[PDB]
Amino acid sequence: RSFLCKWVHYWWVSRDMLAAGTTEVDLRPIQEGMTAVFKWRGKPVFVRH
Amino acid sequence: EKEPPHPPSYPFWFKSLFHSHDIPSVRRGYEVYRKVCATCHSMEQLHFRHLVGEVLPEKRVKQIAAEYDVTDGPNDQGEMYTRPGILGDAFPSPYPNEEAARYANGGAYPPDLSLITAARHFGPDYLMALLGGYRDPPEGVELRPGLYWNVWFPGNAIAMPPPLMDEMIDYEDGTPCNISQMSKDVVNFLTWATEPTADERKLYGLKCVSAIAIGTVLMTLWWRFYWAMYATRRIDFGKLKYL
Amino acid sequence: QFHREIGKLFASYSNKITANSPVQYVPSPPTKGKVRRALSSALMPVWFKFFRGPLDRWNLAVMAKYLRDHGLMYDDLYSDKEPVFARALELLPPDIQAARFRRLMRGTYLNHLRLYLPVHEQNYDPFIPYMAPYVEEAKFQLQEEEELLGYHMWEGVWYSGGVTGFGDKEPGEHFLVALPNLYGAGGSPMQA
Amino acid sequence: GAPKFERKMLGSYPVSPEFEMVWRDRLTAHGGYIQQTISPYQLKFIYPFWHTFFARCWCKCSAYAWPWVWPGLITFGLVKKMNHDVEEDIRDHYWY
Amino acid sequence: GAPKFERKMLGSYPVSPEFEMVWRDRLTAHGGYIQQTISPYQLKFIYPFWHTFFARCWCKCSAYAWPWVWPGLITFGLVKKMNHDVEEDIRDHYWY
Amino acid sequence: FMSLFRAHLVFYRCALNLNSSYNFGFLVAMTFVLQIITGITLAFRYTSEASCAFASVQHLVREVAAGWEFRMLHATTASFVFLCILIHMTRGLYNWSYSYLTTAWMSGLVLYLLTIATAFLGYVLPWGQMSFWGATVITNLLSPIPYLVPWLLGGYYVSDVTLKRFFVLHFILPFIGCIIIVLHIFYLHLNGSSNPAGIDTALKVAFYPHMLMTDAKCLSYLIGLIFLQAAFGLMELSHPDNSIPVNRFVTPLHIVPEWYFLAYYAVLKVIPSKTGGLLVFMSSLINLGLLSEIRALNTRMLIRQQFMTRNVVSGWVIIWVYSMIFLIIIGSAIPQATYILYGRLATILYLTTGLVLCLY
Amino acid sequence: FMSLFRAHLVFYRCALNLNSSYNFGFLVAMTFVLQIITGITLAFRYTSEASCAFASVQHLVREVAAGWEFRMLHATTASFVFLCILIHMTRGLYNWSYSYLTTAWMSGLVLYLLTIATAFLGYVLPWGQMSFWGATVITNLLSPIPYLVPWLLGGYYVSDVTLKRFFVLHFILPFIGCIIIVLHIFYLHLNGSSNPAGIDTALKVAFYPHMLMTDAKCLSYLIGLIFLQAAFGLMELSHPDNSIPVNRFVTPLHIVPEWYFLAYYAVLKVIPSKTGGLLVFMSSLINLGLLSEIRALNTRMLIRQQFMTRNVVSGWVIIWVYSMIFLIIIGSAIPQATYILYGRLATILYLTTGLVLCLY
């Protein structure tokens, strides 16, 4: 059982990834009717005025 | 060429089969490395992530990483920029490429220390001996400028200057500083950095080997159980002898 | 005509060999040339006293003790994976055959235990030649078959009957004729 | 395997596939024999091993002395003499 | 394969391995029969094909008409009507 | 396939006096299966690029759960593969197994060649100094034929192309191994195993209860020892110098192959002509092959008892073993005249004692 | 193994009236062997890194002798694999082969599943836009279970780790294929093939002279056609959009899978609930599996003649084929209400005509 558990665990995500983080966005340059796009935790985020 | 000598065995806490690393020594060795040896060497495989929980508390490690400027980008204009280091970044390096490193060190290349004790014979004993090894030339030998005599380096002539000097650094736990102490602590730190998974490996080893040995005893008994029935058999020819 | 010409070569050589045939027994020519016979004869007094003598005595001591520990004879060391000896064993009489069977059993058991026999069980000569009269007959019988049947490289049908076709007479003894069946229960050659 | 005159059976019942190897190696019991065995649940099985230990060990060690150890000793000798030769060379060639 | 009452042989010679499949599928010739064949070196072999072409082609094409073509025609119809519906939609929804 | 399983591994009947020395085949097979498992799970995260192979192997150890364990099991089980094979070979030299197990002995030799090739291909994949310069040396050694070496390399020098094809070849060869193992066992069970006593006997006993348990016992010991060495590192089986990144214009100052290659290395140190070097390997392997038909090289009827117990004369196989060990010793040391001299002595012994096996 | 060769491929006796429609199995096997050769020789130069896979495939075409030929043969032979498989399946739906070739039919289904998996894994390795977003979609489709998707990916999103393990899996699966093929043929020759007439007949004839030549003829045609399409590019089998490097934050504006996946795609377009989507595939495959024991679903004694010749009623298999082709058509087009409407009509036909096969 220990062997199989280690072998399964070895396919799991690595210890460098961690998916942690936070970000901030300045909204002065945006114009009405426009959609801006940003990067966040590996996925895209839309901000629309 | 010649066979180089072999170093003496020092009693580092870890080189027993039941012992772990010695974490205060590791902290002090890291401090030495930062203040001295990181002037010309690099550890490209290490990230600050590695220090939290294993050596240092997270808060302090973040504050350490914040001391460096680390390059990042491109930005909206396609330019690169510098930012304060974060926990996710690798250790910084003093030279941009091997050519610059050789240019600053008279032609010789300072090796990357990420695996140094696994990349030499007798590992930490060799490193401990090497850091002690600087001495005056013998009769009949002279070395060209920017080259030094060391009794443990192969061929005895080495490009690295004498490495250590008393109270060139200071400790936060209070321990007194001298070249011998610094040698011990930095060798401890580099031995840890060579494979941080050491203690995990050894503690798992112990359970594994113990259980497997108990296994072996049980299987030996089971094998003899069947050995005995044919080892003690009787076969007679012609007529029956005993019963 | 190439083939008949080389025929002529072969035939003349064979006729030479035939013409020199004796009509009665004549002693064989020595196995070593006169130079080596001279050298050996010269060096005998040192070589036999110091080296060959003790070698040939130590050898028999080693052999005898190993055979006596286990209670084997010398002619119990030959296998029946050897055709000549297989024939010889076929020609044996009941008593000799039974005793050989028994000795082999005991030797197997003793080598399993790794226990010496008592010295009073070891009082016999192990080097009696009890298989000789039968080995000579086997040699005769198996030589005549070569002479009368094996004198040419005979031609056959390939990979048919379970035999490769290049000479075998027992089925599936070679890899390319392994696995004779895919369904059913198989069978054995001895029950045909 | 076995010679054809040994692997000839007395019975005529078809040999089942799972017994192939068993009857390829058939041998006759010339003269017959009698055997007795005890179930391993009714035998001691670690005392018989130690009871016969000294005899077995004497036999095994006696058998291996000359063939394995004496050439071993000679080889160990040769290594020591090689070390001598080298440690003398290294001074002759390079020490003033 | 074959029923057991068909694959029962009259001979008793051992079936060789390379003929396995041949005798697993044995069948009886109920009533017997007579057959004749000519060596292919003594036959015409491309004229017999064209000589019987029209009959063979009539048979094959006749057999496939209803089952394959009529549903095919219906499907082709459906595709054309779908195209109609789409080309009308695209104007209704987006042209003023 | 169950009926075959029962015929060969349950009802198969052995001789009563088969001791541990007959258990090492099973053991090498098991190290094969185990090495295959760890192989495949290492392939899932390895990178076959000269620019980054090294760091790819380091990533497993540093950043992957249980990453270190599979690499180290794979590294250490190789040594046991070779150790078990050598014990397994020497047993049959000692017994003269090849007298009647002719084709089994041939198959054995082919399997050993396969194993050498597999190991050496593996040895290049971590892509350190020793890997690069080892590949350089062995590719230069098979130079006699034009253009074959740039072709097999893929290039004028050892390259990323070379790494890619070495990786694929190292993937494939073990399974060809497995096929040849099936062939091996066919020839073996065609005949039947020999005794340590070298007699023919009717005192046979079935496999499943008695011998299966001995196999299992030895298996326990081997699993034990592999884990001991893997987890704690008792012996310095592999030199440190593969820990350094490659440099194409600077050799390492001291050189020591993996132990199972040292004897060969010793030869390349001591014979002057390079072709003589290569021919020694070819000749010794041909001599071993020649033992398959030793019954024909003489008209005296042959026996398997070599009467080596209590014998002051010892036997040619023992002298062979000690010569080989001496060659390993000399392999390990620096190039110096005296080492070369005793090297040549040992080499002559190693060659002669192999030639002489045919002279009964 | 020669005796088996002769028993099964030389002396094996068939029915006289086996026409070309019974030659397509041999053909799919041959495309397998051929695809394996080209696979292995492509592996020698491919790079399994997300940073550089794409350029690795371009290097073969641009800078390697005959580099282009192996890539294009490998790409084009896949289409023929699937085309031959579909003809091979439809033949046995038409004949009701599964009436008595029960386990052969089951084995067939397993082989088809293996082939789908193999192809889709291959489709990701060139690492273009379509590859990345296809992998994203199919991995999201099997999401219902927690943590299974990050585990199988290796990561929170499609990554270099994903590429590495896809490459190894694509390496391995074909050979498992081969093993299952041997199993397939075992079940087949256990029974014996059916006629186009669906009667039992004694007018049998051996394989080697008559049927072997027809196999060879069709083989010539297939090799021909593969080379024609491979060298000249007559049909746009693969969409251009895999020619663009990957971008993780922008999808391609128009999407068309490989043709052998379009019908499935059509379903994912038209059924509202995602789970309903997945369940349609599961249900249809279960229905096909259920045909293996059709003799039990009724007490009337069964015949293999479906009397589809000259029949105005046609047959459920033909309606199935036309429904599937219609679904391919709709697969190919943009998402629009009318396409979805006729999609749903065709989907209902496709499901119902599969259910109804059991109702004799």
Ligand SMILES: CCCCCCCCCCCCCCCCCC(=O)OC[C@H](COP(=O)([O-])OCC(O)COP(=O)([O-])OC[C@@H](COC(=O)CCCCCCCCCCCCCCCCC)OC(=O)CCCCCCCCCCCCCCCCC)OC(=O)CCCCCCCCCCCCCCCCC
């Ligand atoms: C998978 C296989 C495919 C299925 C089909 C089978 C294929 C085999 C066909 C080839 C055989 C053709 C020759 C026919 C000979 C007929 C003679 C006869 O009447 O038969 C009785 C006769 C035996 O009766 P006997 O004399 O009573 O027996 C006593 C003993 O023979 C002891 O007698 P002795 O001690 O008195 O000495 C006698 C010896 C005295 O002579 C010597 O000993 C001379 C020694 C001098 C040293 C030089 C080497 C000699 C060998 C030559 C090899 C060259 C061939 C390869 C060429 C490569 C070209 C690319 O005589 C000979 O050597 C004469 C025969 C030598 C012929 C050997 C080569 C024949 C091959 C020709 C075709 C080559 C094309 C191959 C293409 C590439 C692929 C392989 O048959 C033989 O001796 C057999 C000879 C042929 C070898 C066996 C065939 C191999 C079968 C196993 C297949 C292995 C394939 C492995 C690949 C696996 C892939 C996965």
Ligand SMILES: CCCCCCCCCCCCCCCCCC(=O)OC[C@H](COP(=O)([O-])OCC(O)COP(=O)([O-])OC[C@@H](COC(=O)CCCCCCCCCCCCCCCCC)OC(=O)CCCCCCCCCCCCCCCCC)OC(=O)CCCCCCCCCCCCCCCCC
């Ligand atoms: C004990 C042996 C172990 C063998 C291991 C081999 C290595 C394996 C490596 C791979 C791993 C495999 C794992 C499985 C191994 C096998 C296991 C097994 O079942 O063994 C059965 C073995 C023998 O069974 P058997 O039924 O007698 O076997 C039949 C015989 O072989 C008899 O067979 P035969 O009579 O039929 O003969 C056939 C022939 C067939 O021929 C062969 O098989 C020959 C093979 C030779 C090897 C050839 C290849 C070599 C290749 C080169 C390798 C180089 C490696 C370099 C390594 C360097 C390392 C530094 O064999 C022979 O002739 C063999 C006899 C050789 C005699 C040699 C005599 C040498 C004397 C040396 C004296 C030294 C004195 C030093 C004094 C120093 C003073 C300062 O029995 C045992 O091992 C009994 C169990 C003992 C367990 C004891 C555990 C104690 C633990 C204590 C813990 C303490 C803790 C304290 C804590 C305290 C806390 C306060």
Ligand SMILES: CCCCCCCCCCCCCCCCCC(=O)OC[C@H](COP(=O)([O-])OCC(O)COP(=O)([O-])OC[C@@H](COC(=O)CCCCCCCCCCCCCCCCC)OC(=O)CCCCCCCCCCCCCCCCC)OC(=O)CCCCCCCCCCCCCCCCC
């Ligand atoms: C001809 C057929 C070819 C078939 C090819 C198939 C595709 C293969 C693809 C993969 C590659 C494989 C390669 C090998 C192929 C086979 C080769 C072969 O041996 O064929 C035998 C084939 C038929 O042999 P057989 O013994 O009669 O076969 C038995 C029958 O099947 C009868 O069997 P049964 O009676 O036992 O029935 C069992 C049943 C068993 O069921 C099945 O097998 C059903 C299978 C159905 C397929 C299901 C899967 C579909 C999956 C979806 C695929 C989608 C693909 C999308 C592609 C889009 C492309 C745009 O089969 C049937 O029911 C089949 C009957 C189907 C009837 C359908 C009727 C449709 C009528 C259409 C009319 C169209 C009119 C258009 C008018 C337009 C006006 C504008 O004969 C030939 O091909 C004879 C050779 C002809 C050579 C001619 C060459 C001429 C070259 C001219 C060059 C000119 C150059 C000019 C230069 C000028 C310079 C100045």
Ligand code: HEC
């Ligand atoms: C710049 C002044 C350096 C400092 C500070 C440290 N090292 Fe270094 N090191 C430097 C050079 C130019 C060289 C090359 C030496 C040569 O002969 O080419 C080195 C080498 C080493 C080595 C290699 C030893 C060997 O046998 O190859 C080691 C192990 C080493 N240095 C360790 C080391 C340590 C522990 C340091 C902190 C105490 C340290 N070095 C500082 C340049 C410089």
Ligand code: HEM
């Ligand atoms: C008898 C079977 C095998 C043997 C003897 C063998 C031998 C070796 C050896 C000696 C190494 C060197 C490891 C090191 O130096 O750290 C190695 C590495 C490797 N082997 Fe094998 N191997 C075998 C089977 C396999 C198989 C079947 C695979 C994959 C299917 C495989 C994949 C690898 C990989 C990926 C490495 C690289 C290890 C690394 O980079 O750290 N091996 N092998």
Ligand code: HEM
């Ligand atoms: C992967 C490599 C090998 C495997 C898996 C293997 C496996 C086996 C096995 C399971 C046996 C029967 C049980 C045993 O003897 O332990 C055996 C016997 C034998 N093997 Fe191997 N073996 C290998 C390599 C070799 C080699 C390299 C040789 C010879 C050079 C060889 C020659 C023999 C012989 C002669 C026997 C039978 C000896 C006798 O019956 O007296 N094998 N092998």
Ligand code: HEM
């Ligand atoms: C039935 C067997 C196989 C099928 C159906 C198959 C299918 C495919 C497909 C559809 C592709 C996509 C190629 C492209 O989009 O250009 C591909 C690529 C590939 N296949 Fe397979 N494959 C098979 C066997 C193999 C085998 C056995 C190997 C290696 C041992 C292999 C290695 C590769 C490689 C390396 C690629 C990458 C091609 C490239 O990057 O251009 N394939 N395969």
Ligand code: HEM
């Ligand atoms: C790699 C995939 C496949 C291979 C290599 C293969 C191979 C073969 C071969 C060689 C035959 C005998 C000759 C012939 O019919 O052409 C056969 C027959 C057959 N196969 Fe397949 N096949 C494959 C896939 C399938 C699939 C997907 C199915 C069903 C879904 C299937 C079901 C059958 C049936 C029912 C027969 C016998 C039909 C009859 O005797 O009337 N096979 N196959």
Ligand SMILES: COc1cc2[nH]c(C)c(-c3ccc(Oc4ccc(OC(F)(F)F)cc4)cc3)c(=O)c2cc1Cl
């Ligand atoms: C102590 O004395 C003995 C020990 C012995 N141990 C074993 C393990 C066997 C044996 C090995 C393999 C086998 O069948 C197989 C072939 C090949 C395979 O393939 C592969 F690769 F190994 F998995 C598997 C399976 C059948 C039997 C013996 O005969 C054997 C004989 C003696 Cl005298």
Ligand SMILES: COc1cc2[nH]c(C)c(-c3ccc(Oc4ccc(OC(F)(F)F)cc4)cc3)c(=O)c2cc1Cl
């Ligand atoms: C037109 O009518 C027919 C055509 C037919 N064509 C063929 C090719 C066969 C056939 C296939 C494979 C086989 O044995 C093998 C199994 C598996 C292997 O493995 C692998 F992977 F294919 F190489 C190889 C070989 C034995 C026979 C038939 O039975 C067959 C039957 C009919 Cl009625």
Ligand SMILES: O=C1C(O)=C([C@H]2CC[C@H](c3ccc(Cl)cc3)CC2)C(=O)c2ccccc21
């Ligand atoms: O100089 C050598 C050298 O000579 C070999 C040799 C060892 C023996 C090998 C070998 C010889 C014969 C066979 Cl059958 C198999 C392998 C070939 C490479 C090395 O392995 C090596 C590795 C790294 C740096 C230098 C060297």
Ligand SMILES: O=C1C(O)=C([C@H]2CC[C@H](c3ccc(Cl)cc3)CC2)C(=O)c2ccccc21
């Ligand atoms: O939206 C899709 C999509 O829906 C699929 C689908 C096609 C059908 C596939 C499939 C479905 C069922 C089976 Cl049994 C096998 C494959 C799964 C991926 C794609 O292949 C694709 C590729 C590139 C970009 C977008 C897409």
